[PDB]
Amino acid sequence: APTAPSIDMYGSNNLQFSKIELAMETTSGYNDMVKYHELAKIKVKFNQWSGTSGDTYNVYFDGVKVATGAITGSQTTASFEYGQGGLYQMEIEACDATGCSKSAPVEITIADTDGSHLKPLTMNVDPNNKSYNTDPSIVMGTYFVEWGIYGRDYTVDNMPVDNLTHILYGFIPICGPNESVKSVGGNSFNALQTACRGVNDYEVVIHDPWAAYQKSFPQAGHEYSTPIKGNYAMLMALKQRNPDLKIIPSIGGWTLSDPFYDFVDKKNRDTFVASVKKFLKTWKFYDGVDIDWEFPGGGGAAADKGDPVNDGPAYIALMRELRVMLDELEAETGRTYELTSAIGVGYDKIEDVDYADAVQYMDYIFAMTYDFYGGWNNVPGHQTALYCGSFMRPGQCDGGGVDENGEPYKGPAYTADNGIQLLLAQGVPANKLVLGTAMYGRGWEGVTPDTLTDPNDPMTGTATGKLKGSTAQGVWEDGVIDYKGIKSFMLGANNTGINGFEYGYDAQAEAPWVWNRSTGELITFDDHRSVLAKGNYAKSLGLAGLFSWEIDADNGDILNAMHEGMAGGVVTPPN
Ligand SMILES: S=C=Nc1ccc2oc(C3=NCCN3)cc2c1
Ligand SMILES: S=C=Nc1ccc2oc(C3=NCCN3)cc2c1
């Protein structure tokens, strides 16, 4: 028989192959950093220094023949292509008329972006997240943010994945007009300019490739030379752990919506929709797309954008077009892909889209039932309440009243039920609506007791400015605090108030607050009681389930309450 191939490990890239090439020590244009191949090019060098070399080689993976070719003397390079990622025991055999001889087996890795080469992720979840057996039909969603790995120090293996059905990954930008991103300060706008160098406008990119795929996480067993790293390799390894988990990129958001206003021109939608198909072929762990345009008709971060007449028809077309695209991917892959969107729920946002037409294309609508009130002005109110609070005036709830100056309210007040009912009344199915819960508070200072028109209700006061605090307190920007900061700095363990805050609850709105009467610090948020009330409301109306913004800011209490409030419930999944 021929001499047995001896595999040259260092001559064959120590048997590490990747279907994706990712730039690792530089930051450039997305199309210069990211190259994906349908088949990996496998090249394995071997030698046969003694004896006869033979005529032909065969490559085996786990005992099955995957490639064959000619022997070239004493040194041969086996070159072939292979589509399926994984870890395999490879053997190379040499054959001639006399017989065949084979190398010892050695493990080959073929990386792919479904995580098929990876073991299930090792988790490191705060043990305050409890276990439940919520019915699998119910959505339990949340947003994980790409930048949460910096100061917030919250990584993929921290998520309580067994308690989630959907992870929306916040956020994928669209190249093009993006002045709103300058409002975050720091390097975010300039990072986007780098990502978009050499990329056509209206195509998606990764905003932060360091966080997405370059940074080595030692808890995920990453090495500097590991071919895929960052949050994306962790999400791949999470999907190996929990294969029924849906991981969906979220396009847009508050700061990254400015390009959507140009989707009134179909040409820009076509560019966008093709890029999203490419994106999902590249990054196979994703299961669909979520569109967070804030908002058709305007009222988002860009004060100079928004077309009430045209943006709704654009949104609907987008959804129509994205669904055609996703149907192509389902044909190509055999997989099921979801199309969703987070939407505003004020009456003036919902009136700009004919959702009866859009929703036919969509699996879920994540109703943004939060940010109703906040530190952008000095008017207290409940930011995430189901119903109208005590603080509201006669006829403010349904919009038929007049304000304190005698001016007509222009529509119903901002509450979760006013927006859910406006969506239902136009024919959006209940079982496609997902109700939002807040893992953060918004707040004010200067709401001192002398400013209240009703002394029992700090939501009848007036502020002097936004809540201020430090990042250790969960205050990453003025007027906004993580729920785990409210719990550590205002509620305490027994939920009865610390540091001069008192707890209160508006039983008519279903909305909690904490109030320090000395500093006039007032914070509106969601707590155990209000999130049980959202679960009971969702069960009562047959909504699809609950989602939350943002998972790093919880300590387990809010996600636990989402599940508790859903106990016993089942729902019909949309077809
Ligand atoms: S690098 C470092 N820190 C970072 C890097 C990127 C970031 O993005 C945000 C942001 N805040 C609201 C929406 N996006 C914060 C933030 C901090
Ligand atoms: S980053 C960013 N985060 C956000 C996310 C949502 C938001 O809503 C507002 C708001 N401003 C006036 C009315 N609503 C600000 C704002 C900032």
Give the pairing of strands 288-292 and 246-252.
parallel
- Per DSSP, the three-state class of 91 is strand
CB atoms near residue 150 (< 10 Å):
11
Q: Which residue has the tokens 């086996």?
A: 78
Distance in angstroms (rounded) separating the CA atoms of residues 346 and 355? 14
Cα 202 to Cα 173: distance, rounded to the nearest angstrom: 9
How far, in Å, are 180, 182, 191, 255, 299 from residue 185 at the CA level?
Answer: 10, 5, 11, 11, 21
Nearest to residue 2, comparing CAs of 53, 77, 68, 69?
A: 53
In ligand 1, the atom with minimum distance to the C-alpha of 208 is 6
Q: Which ligand places an atom closest to the C-alpha of 173?
A: 1
- State if residue 150 touches ligand 1 by the CB under 6 angstroms criterion: yes
Alpha helices per DSSP H over 175-298: 188-195, 209, 230-241, 266-282
CA–CA distance from 168 to each of 250, 288, 342 (Å)? 6, 10, 10
3-state secondary structure 210-239: HHHHHCCCHHHCCCCCCCCCHHHHHHHHHH
From ligand 2's centre to the CA of 301, what distance in Å?
Answer: 7
Ligand 1, atom 5, residue with closest C-alpha: 147
What DSSP assignment string belongs to 6-45?
Answer: EEESGGGGGGEEESEEE--S----HHHHEEE-SSEEEEEE
Let me know: does 90 contact 15? Beta carbons within 8 Å. yes
* Active site amino acids: 294
Task: Using the mean position of ligand 1's atoms as its centre, give its distance from the Cα of residue 147 in Å.
Answer: 5
Q: Answer yes or no: is the C-beta of 292 below 6 A from any ligand 2 atom.
A: no
Q: Which of 179, 181, 254 to mutate to test the pocket of ligand 2 (most atoms within 8 A of CB)?
A: 254
Q: How far is CA 134 from the centre of its chain?
A: 21
Q: In angstroms, rounded to a whole number, what is the distance separating the alpha carbons of residues 249 and 545?
A: 19
Q: Are 547 and 437 in contact (CB under 8 A)?
A: yes
- CA–CA gap between residue 129 and residue 163 (Å, rounded): 8
Contact 407, 399 (CB under 8 A): no
- Please indicate whether residue 376, judged by its CB atom, sits closer than 6 Å to ligand 2: yes
Please tell me if the CB atom of residue 255 comes closer than 6 angstroms to any atom of ligand 1.
yes
- What is the full DSSP assignment across 346-392? SHHHHTTS-HHHHGGG-SEEEE----SS-TTSS----SS-SS--TTS
Domains parsed from the chain with CATH numbers: 1-111 (2.60.40.10), 112-438+525-575 (3.20.20.80), 439-524 (3.10.50.10)
Contact criterion met (CB below 8 Å) for 287 and 246: yes
Q: Are 516 and 499 in contact (CB under 8 A)?
A: yes
- Taking the centre of ligand 1 as the mean of its atom positions, its distance from the CA of residue 325, in whole angstroms, is 31
254: CA distance to ligand 2 center in Å? 6
Dihedral sign computed on CA atoms, order 354, 357, 358, 362: positive
Query: Which residues, listed in sequence order, are joined to residue 550 by a DSSP beta bridge?
Result: none
- How would you classify residue 15: left for phi > 0, otherwise alpha for psi between -120 and 50, otherwise beta? left
Total residues belonging to the chain: 575
The torsion of the CA quartet 78, 81, 87, 88, rounded to 10 degrees, works out to: -50
On the CB side of 413, CA atoms within 13 Å amount to 24
Q: Alpha-carbon torsion 132, 137, 143, 148, what sign?
A: positive
- What stretch of H or E contains 186? none
Closest-CA residue, ligand 1 atom 10, reads: 184
Distance, CA of 16 to CA of 88 (rounded, Å):
11
Q: 250: which 2 tokens?
A: 């979220």
Nearest CA to ligand 2 atom 11: 376
Burial (CB < 10 A; 0-12, 13-18, 19+), residue 177, is middle
418 with 410: CB under 8 angstroms? no
Pairing label, strands 545-549, 433-438? parallel
DSSP states of 95-153: EETTEEEEPPPEEEEEE-TT-TTSPPPPP---TTSPP----TTSEEEEEEEGGGGSTT-
For a mutational test of ligand 1's pocket, the pick from 27, 147, 257, 471, i.e. the residue with the most ligand atoms closer than 8 A to its C-beta, is 147
Residue pair 261/306 in contact by the 8 Å Cβ criterion: yes
Q: How far is CA 511 from the centre of its chain?
A: 26
Q: Measuring CA to CA, which residue among 274, 254, 278 is closest to residue 31?
A: 278
SS3 assignment, position 460: helix
Is ligand 1 within 6 A of the CB of residue 147? yes
417 lines ligand 2 (CB under 6 A): no
